[PDB]
Amino acid sequence: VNSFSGYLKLTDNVYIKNADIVEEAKKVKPTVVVNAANVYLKHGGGVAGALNKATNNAMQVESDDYIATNGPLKVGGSCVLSGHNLAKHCLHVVGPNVNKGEDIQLLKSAYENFNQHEVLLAPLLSAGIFGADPIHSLRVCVDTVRTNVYLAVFDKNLYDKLVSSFLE
Ligand SMILES: Nc1nccc2ccccc12
């Protein structure tokens, strides 16, 4: 149904809300939720752990089956797997992990994966355990994504800083 509500329109195609992405998925019934994935699709932490728990581990079971046959993703890459109870599809996108020395330039590649989907519910890529500057990630999103992205930011303080930064 893609019933997004209460988002702040930043650009013609980028929207943001102070919300929990899992509760958004339940409310919106998006066609596509983006996962903040790693290359092995091991969803023990970060947004990936939240999404996987909300699928009662179905996302991890599917992901383990996928990796054993298909091999890992690349940093900056993506795959499309089931959305389970959260969405029709899950776009698993690997942003660079700058806490582990990966090149922040790959954040552009990461966001380019969104352009194959008309509308997405997504987290800010490379945030949290991936260590990138969230203000920078929002700029790369706005500069790179051409399709309609609805960003959910959990932490109110961080939301407020992102919106302030963007309106400067
Ligand atoms: N659950 C959730 N939703 C949106 C953004 C997040 C960022 C980090 C952890 C959880 C998040």
Short mmCIF file of N, CA and C and ligand atoms in Angstrom, two decimals:
data_model
loop_
_atom_site.label_atom_id
_atom_site.label_comp_id
_atom_site.label_asym_id
_atom_site.label_seq_id
_atom_site.Cartn_x
_atom_site.Cartn_y
_atom_site.Cartn_z
N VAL A 1 0.83 -1.15 0.00
CA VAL A 1 0.00 0.00 0.00
C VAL A 1 0.90 1.25 0.00
N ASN A 2 2.16 1.26 0.52
CA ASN A 2 3.03 2.47 0.48
C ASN A 2 2.30 3.69 1.07
N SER A 3 1.63 3.48 2.19
CA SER A 3 0.89 4.55 2.89
C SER A 3 1.85 5.22 3.87
N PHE A 4 2.77 6.00 3.32
CA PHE A 4 3.72 6.81 4.10
C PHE A 4 2.93 8.01 4.66
N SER A 5 3.12 8.32 5.91
CA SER A 5 2.44 9.48 6.53
C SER A 5 3.40 10.25 7.43
N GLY A 6 3.21 11.56 7.47
CA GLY A 6 4.01 12.39 8.39
C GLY A 6 5.46 12.57 8.01
N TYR A 7 5.83 12.36 6.76
CA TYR A 7 7.21 12.61 6.36
C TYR A 7 7.40 14.07 6.05
N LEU A 8 8.61 14.53 6.22
CA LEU A 8 9.07 15.86 5.81
C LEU A 8 9.73 15.76 4.44
N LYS A 9 9.21 16.47 3.46
CA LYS A 9 9.75 16.44 2.10
C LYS A 9 11.01 17.29 2.07
N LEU A 10 12.17 16.70 1.82
CA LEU A 10 13.44 17.44 1.73
C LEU A 10 13.68 17.89 0.29
N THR A 11 13.47 17.02 -0.67
CA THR A 11 13.62 17.33 -2.12
C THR A 11 12.43 16.73 -2.82
N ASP A 12 12.39 16.86 -4.13
CA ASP A 12 11.28 16.32 -4.93
C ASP A 12 11.13 14.83 -4.67
N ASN A 13 12.21 14.11 -4.30
CA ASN A 13 12.12 12.64 -4.17
C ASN A 13 12.66 12.09 -2.84
N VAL A 14 13.10 12.91 -1.89
CA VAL A 14 13.64 12.42 -0.60
C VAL A 14 12.81 12.98 0.52
N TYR A 15 12.38 12.08 1.38
CA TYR A 15 11.49 12.38 2.52
C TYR A 15 12.10 11.83 3.77
N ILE A 16 11.81 12.40 4.92
CA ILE A 16 12.43 11.91 6.18
C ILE A 16 11.43 11.98 7.32
N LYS A 17 11.53 11.07 8.26
CA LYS A 17 10.64 11.01 9.42
C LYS A 17 11.43 10.50 10.58
N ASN A 18 11.13 11.03 11.77
CA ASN A 18 11.67 10.52 13.04
C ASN A 18 10.81 9.33 13.43
N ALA A 19 11.25 8.13 13.17
CA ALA A 19 10.44 6.93 13.35
C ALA A 19 11.35 5.74 13.40
N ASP A 20 10.80 4.67 13.93
CA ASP A 20 11.40 3.32 13.92
C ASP A 20 11.02 2.65 12.60
N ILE A 21 12.02 2.24 11.85
CA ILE A 21 11.78 1.64 10.50
C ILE A 21 10.90 0.40 10.61
N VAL A 22 11.02 -0.38 11.70
CA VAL A 22 10.15 -1.58 11.81
C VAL A 22 8.69 -1.17 11.97
N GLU A 23 8.42 -0.18 12.81
CA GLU A 23 7.04 0.28 13.00
C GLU A 23 6.55 0.95 11.71
N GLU A 24 7.43 1.66 11.02
CA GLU A 24 7.03 2.20 9.71
C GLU A 24 6.64 1.08 8.75
N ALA A 25 7.45 0.02 8.68
CA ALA A 25 7.14 -1.04 7.72
C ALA A 25 5.74 -1.57 8.01
N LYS A 26 5.46 -1.79 9.29
CA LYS A 26 4.14 -2.36 9.69
C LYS A 26 3.03 -1.42 9.29
N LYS A 27 3.20 -0.12 9.46
CA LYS A 27 2.15 0.91 9.22
C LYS A 27 1.99 1.15 7.71
N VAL A 28 3.09 1.21 6.97
CA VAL A 28 3.07 1.67 5.58
C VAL A 28 2.76 0.54 4.62
N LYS A 29 3.20 -0.67 4.95
CA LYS A 29 3.12 -1.83 4.02
C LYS A 29 3.83 -1.46 2.72
N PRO A 30 5.15 -1.20 2.81
CA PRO A 30 5.84 -0.73 1.61
C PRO A 30 6.03 -1.89 0.61
N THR A 31 6.14 -1.53 -0.65
CA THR A 31 6.64 -2.49 -1.65
C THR A 31 8.07 -2.93 -1.32
N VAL A 32 8.93 -2.03 -0.88
CA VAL A 32 10.35 -2.37 -0.67
C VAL A 32 10.82 -1.72 0.63
N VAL A 33 11.39 -2.52 1.52
CA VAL A 33 12.15 -1.97 2.65
C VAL A 33 13.62 -2.21 2.35
N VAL A 34 14.43 -1.23 2.62
CA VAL A 34 15.89 -1.38 2.50
C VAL A 34 16.45 -1.88 3.82
N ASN A 35 17.31 -2.91 3.76
CA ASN A 35 18.12 -3.33 4.89
C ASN A 35 19.51 -2.75 4.79
N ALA A 36 20.04 -2.30 5.91
CA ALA A 36 21.45 -1.92 6.08
C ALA A 36 22.22 -3.21 6.24
N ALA A 37 22.50 -3.88 5.14
CA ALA A 37 23.11 -5.20 5.13
C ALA A 37 24.63 -5.15 5.16
N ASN A 38 25.25 -6.25 5.57
CA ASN A 38 26.65 -6.53 5.29
C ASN A 38 26.81 -7.58 4.21
N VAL A 39 28.03 -7.80 3.77
CA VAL A 39 28.25 -8.63 2.57
C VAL A 39 27.83 -10.07 2.77
N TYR A 40 27.83 -10.58 3.99
CA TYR A 40 27.44 -11.96 4.30
C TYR A 40 25.99 -12.06 4.72
N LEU A 41 25.22 -10.96 4.67
CA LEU A 41 23.80 -11.00 5.09
C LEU A 41 23.64 -11.69 6.44
N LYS A 42 24.48 -11.27 7.40
CA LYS A 42 24.38 -11.72 8.80
C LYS A 42 23.78 -10.60 9.58
N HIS A 43 22.55 -10.74 9.98
CA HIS A 43 21.70 -9.70 10.47
C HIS A 43 21.65 -9.71 11.99
N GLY A 44 22.79 -9.86 12.64
CA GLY A 44 22.79 -9.89 14.11
C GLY A 44 22.79 -8.54 14.74
N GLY A 45 23.02 -7.47 14.04
CA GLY A 45 23.22 -6.16 14.68
C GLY A 45 22.61 -5.07 13.87
N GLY A 46 22.57 -3.88 14.44
CA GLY A 46 22.12 -2.68 13.72
C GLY A 46 20.69 -2.78 13.22
N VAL A 47 20.37 -2.01 12.20
CA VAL A 47 19.02 -2.05 11.58
C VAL A 47 18.72 -3.49 11.12
N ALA A 48 19.71 -4.18 10.60
CA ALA A 48 19.48 -5.53 10.08
C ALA A 48 18.92 -6.43 11.18
N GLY A 49 19.47 -6.31 12.41
CA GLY A 49 18.96 -7.11 13.54
C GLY A 49 17.53 -6.76 13.90
N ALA A 50 17.17 -5.49 13.82
CA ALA A 50 15.79 -5.05 14.09
C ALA A 50 14.86 -5.65 13.05
N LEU A 51 15.22 -5.51 11.78
CA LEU A 51 14.36 -6.07 10.71
C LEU A 51 14.26 -7.59 10.84
N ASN A 52 15.37 -8.24 11.09
CA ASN A 52 15.32 -9.71 11.17
C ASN A 52 14.45 -10.15 12.35
N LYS A 53 14.62 -9.52 13.52
CA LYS A 53 13.78 -9.88 14.70
C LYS A 53 12.33 -9.68 14.35
N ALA A 54 11.97 -8.63 13.64
CA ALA A 54 10.57 -8.37 13.29
C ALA A 54 10.01 -9.40 12.31
N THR A 55 10.86 -10.12 11.61
CA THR A 55 10.46 -11.28 10.77
C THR A 55 10.56 -12.58 11.55
N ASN A 56 10.79 -12.55 12.84
CA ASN A 56 10.94 -13.79 13.65
C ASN A 56 11.98 -14.69 13.01
N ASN A 57 13.10 -14.11 12.60
CA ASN A 57 14.31 -14.77 12.08
C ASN A 57 14.10 -15.33 10.67
N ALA A 58 12.96 -15.12 10.02
CA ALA A 58 12.77 -15.65 8.65
C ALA A 58 13.78 -15.00 7.69
N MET A 59 14.06 -13.72 7.88
CA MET A 59 15.03 -13.02 7.01
C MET A 59 16.40 -13.68 7.14
N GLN A 60 16.84 -14.02 8.33
CA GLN A 60 18.17 -14.66 8.49
C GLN A 60 18.20 -16.04 7.86
N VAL A 61 17.14 -16.83 8.05
CA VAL A 61 17.08 -18.18 7.46
C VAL A 61 17.19 -18.08 5.95
N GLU A 62 16.42 -17.19 5.35
CA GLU A 62 16.46 -17.01 3.90
C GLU A 62 17.84 -16.55 3.45
N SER A 63 18.43 -15.61 4.18
CA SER A 63 19.73 -15.04 3.84
C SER A 63 20.82 -16.10 3.95
N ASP A 64 20.79 -16.95 4.95
CA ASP A 64 21.81 -18.01 5.07
C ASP A 64 21.71 -18.97 3.93
N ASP A 65 20.51 -19.33 3.52
CA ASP A 65 20.31 -20.20 2.36
C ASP A 65 20.83 -19.54 1.11
N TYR A 66 20.56 -18.26 0.93
CA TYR A 66 21.02 -17.52 -0.24
C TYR A 66 22.54 -17.50 -0.29
N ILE A 67 23.23 -17.13 0.80
CA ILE A 67 24.68 -16.95 0.75
C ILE A 67 25.38 -18.26 0.46
N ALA A 68 24.88 -19.36 0.99
CA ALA A 68 25.61 -20.65 0.88
C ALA A 68 25.69 -21.08 -0.58
N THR A 69 24.72 -20.68 -1.40
CA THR A 69 24.69 -21.01 -2.84
C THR A 69 25.26 -19.90 -3.69
N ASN A 70 24.98 -18.65 -3.33
CA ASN A 70 25.18 -17.49 -4.24
C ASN A 70 26.40 -16.68 -3.91
N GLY A 71 26.99 -16.85 -2.74
CA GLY A 71 28.17 -16.08 -2.36
C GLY A 71 27.78 -14.70 -1.86
N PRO A 72 28.78 -14.01 -1.27
CA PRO A 72 28.55 -12.72 -0.64
C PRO A 72 28.26 -11.61 -1.63
N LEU A 73 27.70 -10.52 -1.10
CA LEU A 73 27.54 -9.28 -1.88
C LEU A 73 28.89 -8.58 -1.89
N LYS A 74 28.97 -7.51 -2.66
CA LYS A 74 30.13 -6.58 -2.63
C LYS A 74 29.71 -5.34 -1.86
N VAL A 75 30.69 -4.69 -1.26
CA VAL A 75 30.44 -3.38 -0.64
C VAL A 75 30.00 -2.41 -1.73
N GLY A 76 28.91 -1.71 -1.50
CA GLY A 76 28.28 -0.85 -2.49
C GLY A 76 27.22 -1.57 -3.29
N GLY A 77 27.05 -2.86 -3.08
CA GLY A 77 26.12 -3.69 -3.84
C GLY A 77 24.82 -3.97 -3.12
N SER A 78 23.99 -4.78 -3.76
CA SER A 78 22.68 -5.12 -3.20
C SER A 78 22.18 -6.43 -3.76
N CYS A 79 21.19 -6.99 -3.10
CA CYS A 79 20.36 -8.08 -3.64
C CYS A 79 18.93 -7.81 -3.21
N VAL A 80 17.99 -8.43 -3.90
CA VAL A 80 16.57 -8.36 -3.56
C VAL A 80 16.11 -9.72 -3.08
N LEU A 81 15.68 -9.79 -1.84
CA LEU A 81 15.13 -11.02 -1.24
C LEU A 81 13.73 -10.72 -0.76
N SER A 82 13.11 -11.67 -0.09
CA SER A 82 11.73 -11.46 0.37
C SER A 82 11.65 -10.34 1.39
N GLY A 83 10.55 -9.60 1.38
CA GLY A 83 10.24 -8.68 2.48
C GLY A 83 9.54 -9.34 3.65
N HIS A 84 9.19 -10.60 3.54
CA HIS A 84 8.52 -11.34 4.63
C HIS A 84 7.27 -10.58 5.02
N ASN A 85 7.08 -10.34 6.30
CA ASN A 85 5.89 -9.65 6.82
C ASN A 85 6.06 -8.15 6.78
N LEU A 86 7.23 -7.62 6.42
CA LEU A 86 7.52 -6.20 6.50
C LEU A 86 7.23 -5.49 5.18
N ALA A 87 7.37 -6.14 4.03
CA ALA A 87 7.30 -5.49 2.72
C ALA A 87 7.11 -6.59 1.69
N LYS A 88 6.83 -6.21 0.46
CA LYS A 88 6.88 -7.24 -0.60
C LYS A 88 8.33 -7.74 -0.76
N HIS A 89 9.26 -6.81 -0.86
CA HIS A 89 10.67 -7.10 -1.15
C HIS A 89 11.53 -6.47 -0.05
N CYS A 90 12.69 -7.06 0.17
CA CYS A 90 13.76 -6.41 0.94
C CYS A 90 14.95 -6.22 0.01
N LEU A 91 15.33 -4.96 -0.16
CA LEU A 91 16.57 -4.60 -0.87
C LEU A 91 17.66 -4.54 0.17
N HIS A 92 18.50 -5.55 0.17
CA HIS A 92 19.65 -5.59 1.09
C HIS A 92 20.77 -4.80 0.45
N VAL A 93 21.16 -3.68 1.05
CA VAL A 93 22.16 -2.78 0.46
C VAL A 93 23.34 -2.70 1.42
N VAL A 94 24.54 -2.86 0.87
CA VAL A 94 25.77 -2.83 1.68
C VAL A 94 26.43 -1.45 1.50
N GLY A 95 26.29 -0.61 2.50
CA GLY A 95 27.09 0.61 2.57
C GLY A 95 28.47 0.28 3.08
N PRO A 96 29.47 1.13 2.80
CA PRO A 96 30.80 0.94 3.39
C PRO A 96 30.75 1.05 4.91
N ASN A 97 31.54 0.17 5.53
CA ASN A 97 31.76 0.22 6.98
C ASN A 97 33.07 0.97 7.23
N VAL A 98 32.94 2.25 7.48
CA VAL A 98 34.13 3.10 7.72
C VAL A 98 34.69 2.84 9.10
N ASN A 99 33.94 2.24 10.02
CA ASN A 99 34.57 1.77 11.31
C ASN A 99 35.53 0.64 11.03
N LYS A 100 35.46 -0.03 9.89
CA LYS A 100 36.32 -1.19 9.54
C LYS A 100 37.16 -0.86 8.31
N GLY A 101 37.38 0.42 8.02
CA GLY A 101 38.36 0.89 7.01
C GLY A 101 37.88 0.90 5.57
N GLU A 102 36.60 0.65 5.30
CA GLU A 102 36.10 0.58 3.91
C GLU A 102 35.94 2.01 3.38
N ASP A 103 36.01 2.13 2.08
CA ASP A 103 36.04 3.44 1.41
C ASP A 103 34.66 4.10 1.44
N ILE A 104 34.57 5.26 2.05
CA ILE A 104 33.31 6.02 2.09
C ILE A 104 32.81 6.35 0.68
N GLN A 105 33.67 6.42 -0.30
CA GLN A 105 33.22 6.67 -1.69
C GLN A 105 32.19 5.64 -2.15
N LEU A 106 32.23 4.44 -1.58
CA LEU A 106 31.28 3.38 -1.98
C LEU A 106 29.87 3.70 -1.52
N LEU A 107 29.66 4.73 -0.73
CA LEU A 107 28.30 5.10 -0.35
C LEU A 107 27.51 5.54 -1.57
N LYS A 108 28.14 6.13 -2.58
CA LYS A 108 27.42 6.51 -3.81
C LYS A 108 26.92 5.24 -4.50
N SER A 109 27.79 4.28 -4.75
CA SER A 109 27.35 2.98 -5.29
C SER A 109 26.20 2.42 -4.46
N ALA A 110 26.33 2.46 -3.15
CA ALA A 110 25.30 1.90 -2.27
C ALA A 110 23.94 2.53 -2.58
N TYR A 111 23.86 3.84 -2.60
CA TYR A 111 22.59 4.52 -2.86
C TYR A 111 22.11 4.30 -4.30
N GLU A 112 23.00 4.09 -5.26
CA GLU A 112 22.55 3.83 -6.65
C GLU A 112 21.69 2.59 -6.74
N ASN A 113 21.82 1.65 -5.81
CA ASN A 113 20.94 0.47 -5.80
C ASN A 113 19.48 0.87 -5.61
N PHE A 114 19.19 2.00 -5.00
CA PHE A 114 17.80 2.43 -4.79
C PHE A 114 17.11 2.79 -6.09
N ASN A 115 17.88 3.12 -7.11
CA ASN A 115 17.27 3.66 -8.36
C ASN A 115 16.57 2.62 -9.20
N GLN A 116 16.63 1.35 -8.80
CA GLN A 116 15.90 0.28 -9.48
C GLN A 116 14.52 0.05 -8.88
N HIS A 117 14.10 0.87 -7.93
CA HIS A 117 12.84 0.71 -7.18
C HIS A 117 12.15 2.06 -7.13
N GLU A 118 10.86 2.09 -7.48
CA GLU A 118 10.14 3.37 -7.63
C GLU A 118 10.01 4.09 -6.28
N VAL A 119 9.74 3.34 -5.23
CA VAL A 119 9.47 3.88 -3.87
C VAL A 119 10.14 2.95 -2.86
N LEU A 120 10.82 3.51 -1.86
CA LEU A 120 11.46 2.66 -0.84
C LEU A 120 11.27 3.28 0.54
N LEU A 121 11.11 2.42 1.53
CA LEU A 121 11.32 2.75 2.96
C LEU A 121 12.77 2.39 3.28
N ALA A 122 13.56 3.29 3.83
CA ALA A 122 14.98 3.01 4.03
C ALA A 122 15.52 3.67 5.27
N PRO A 123 16.59 3.08 5.83
CA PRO A 123 17.43 3.75 6.80
C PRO A 123 18.49 4.58 6.09
N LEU A 124 19.12 5.46 6.85
CA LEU A 124 20.28 6.18 6.38
C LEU A 124 21.45 5.22 6.21
N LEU A 125 22.05 5.11 5.03
CA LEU A 125 23.08 4.09 4.82
C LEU A 125 24.37 4.48 5.51
N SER A 126 25.08 3.45 5.96
CA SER A 126 26.41 3.53 6.61
C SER A 126 26.35 4.24 7.96
N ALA A 127 25.20 4.37 8.57
CA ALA A 127 25.08 4.92 9.93
C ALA A 127 25.35 3.82 10.97
N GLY A 128 25.41 4.21 12.21
CA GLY A 128 25.42 3.25 13.32
C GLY A 128 26.70 2.46 13.34
N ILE A 129 26.58 1.14 13.35
CA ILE A 129 27.76 0.24 13.35
C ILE A 129 28.62 0.45 12.12
N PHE A 130 28.12 1.05 11.04
CA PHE A 130 28.95 1.27 9.85
C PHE A 130 29.77 2.56 9.97
N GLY A 131 29.44 3.47 10.88
CA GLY A 131 30.39 4.51 11.32
C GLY A 131 30.44 5.75 10.49
N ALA A 132 29.68 5.93 9.45
CA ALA A 132 29.81 7.11 8.59
C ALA A 132 29.05 8.25 9.17
N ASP A 133 29.48 9.44 8.83
CA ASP A 133 28.84 10.71 9.20
C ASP A 133 27.44 10.75 8.61
N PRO A 134 26.39 10.80 9.44
CA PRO A 134 25.03 10.77 8.91
C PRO A 134 24.68 11.97 8.01
N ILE A 135 25.21 13.15 8.35
CA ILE A 135 24.97 14.34 7.52
C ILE A 135 25.51 14.08 6.11
N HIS A 136 26.68 13.49 6.02
CA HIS A 136 27.25 13.11 4.71
C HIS A 136 26.38 12.09 4.01
N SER A 137 25.94 11.06 4.71
CA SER A 137 25.09 10.04 4.09
C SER A 137 23.82 10.66 3.51
N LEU A 138 23.19 11.58 4.24
CA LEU A 138 21.98 12.24 3.69
C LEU A 138 22.30 13.01 2.41
N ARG A 139 23.42 13.69 2.37
CA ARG A 139 23.81 14.42 1.15
C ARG A 139 24.00 13.43 0.01
N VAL A 140 24.70 12.33 0.24
CA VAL A 140 24.92 11.36 -0.87
C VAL A 140 23.56 10.82 -1.31
N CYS A 141 22.66 10.56 -0.37
CA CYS A 141 21.32 10.09 -0.76
C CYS A 141 20.62 11.09 -1.69
N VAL A 142 20.58 12.34 -1.26
CA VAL A 142 19.89 13.38 -2.03
C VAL A 142 20.53 13.54 -3.40
N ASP A 143 21.85 13.43 -3.50
CA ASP A 143 22.56 13.66 -4.76
C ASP A 143 22.44 12.47 -5.68
N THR A 144 22.19 11.28 -5.15
CA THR A 144 22.32 10.03 -5.92
C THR A 144 20.98 9.40 -6.24
N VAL A 145 20.09 9.35 -5.29
CA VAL A 145 18.79 8.66 -5.48
C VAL A 145 17.87 9.55 -6.31
N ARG A 146 17.28 8.96 -7.35
CA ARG A 146 16.32 9.62 -8.24
C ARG A 146 14.90 9.14 -8.01
N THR A 147 14.73 7.97 -7.45
CA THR A 147 13.40 7.41 -7.13
C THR A 147 12.98 7.92 -5.77
N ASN A 148 11.83 7.57 -5.29
CA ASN A 148 11.25 8.20 -4.08
C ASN A 148 11.69 7.40 -2.88
N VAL A 149 12.41 8.05 -1.99
CA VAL A 149 12.94 7.41 -0.78
C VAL A 149 12.36 8.08 0.45
N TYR A 150 11.89 7.24 1.34
CA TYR A 150 11.29 7.63 2.64
C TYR A 150 12.27 7.12 3.71
N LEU A 151 12.99 8.03 4.31
CA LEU A 151 14.03 7.69 5.28
C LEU A 151 13.47 7.73 6.68
N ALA A 152 13.71 6.71 7.46
CA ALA A 152 13.27 6.63 8.87
C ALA A 152 14.51 6.76 9.74
N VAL A 153 14.53 7.74 10.63
CA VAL A 153 15.64 7.98 11.56
C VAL A 153 15.06 7.86 12.97
N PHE A 154 15.66 6.94 13.71
CA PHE A 154 15.15 6.45 15.00
C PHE A 154 15.36 7.52 16.08
N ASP A 155 16.58 8.01 16.16
CA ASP A 155 17.09 8.91 17.22
C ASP A 155 16.63 10.33 16.92
N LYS A 156 15.83 10.91 17.81
CA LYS A 156 15.29 12.25 17.65
C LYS A 156 16.42 13.30 17.53
N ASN A 157 17.44 13.20 18.38
CA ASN A 157 18.55 14.18 18.35
C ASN A 157 19.15 14.19 16.95
N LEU A 158 19.46 12.99 16.44
CA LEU A 158 20.10 12.85 15.12
C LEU A 158 19.13 13.36 14.06
N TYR A 159 17.85 13.03 14.14
CA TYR A 159 16.86 13.54 13.17
C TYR A 159 16.95 15.08 13.10
N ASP A 160 16.87 15.69 14.27
CA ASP A 160 16.85 17.16 14.36
C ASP A 160 18.11 17.76 13.75
N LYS A 161 19.25 17.13 14.01
CA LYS A 161 20.52 17.61 13.41
C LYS A 161 20.53 17.42 11.91
N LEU A 162 19.98 16.33 11.40
CA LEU A 162 19.92 16.11 9.95
C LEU A 162 19.03 17.15 9.32
N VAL A 163 17.84 17.41 9.88
CA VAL A 163 16.92 18.37 9.24
C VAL A 163 17.54 19.78 9.29
N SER A 164 18.08 20.17 10.43
CA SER A 164 18.77 21.47 10.58
C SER A 164 19.86 21.60 9.51
N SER A 165 20.69 20.59 9.41
CA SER A 165 21.80 20.57 8.43
C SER A 165 21.29 20.74 7.02
N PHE A 166 20.22 20.08 6.70
CA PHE A 166 19.72 20.06 5.33
C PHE A 166 19.08 21.40 4.95
N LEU A 167 18.46 22.05 5.92
CA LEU A 167 17.79 23.34 5.66
C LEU A 167 18.78 24.50 5.69
N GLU A 168 20.04 24.32 6.12
CA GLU A 168 21.05 25.41 6.08
C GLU A 168 21.17 25.98 4.65
N1 LIG B 1 14.82 0.65 13.93
C1 LIG B 1 15.47 1.75 13.25
N2 LIG B 1 14.76 2.52 12.44
C2 LIG B 1 15.30 3.55 11.79
C3 LIG B 1 16.65 3.84 11.96
C4 LIG B 1 17.45 3.03 12.83
C5 LIG B 1 18.83 3.30 13.02
C6 LIG B 1 19.58 2.50 13.88
C7 LIG B 1 18.98 1.43 14.54
C8 LIG B 1 17.63 1.16 14.35
C9 LIG B 1 16.86 1.99 13.48
#
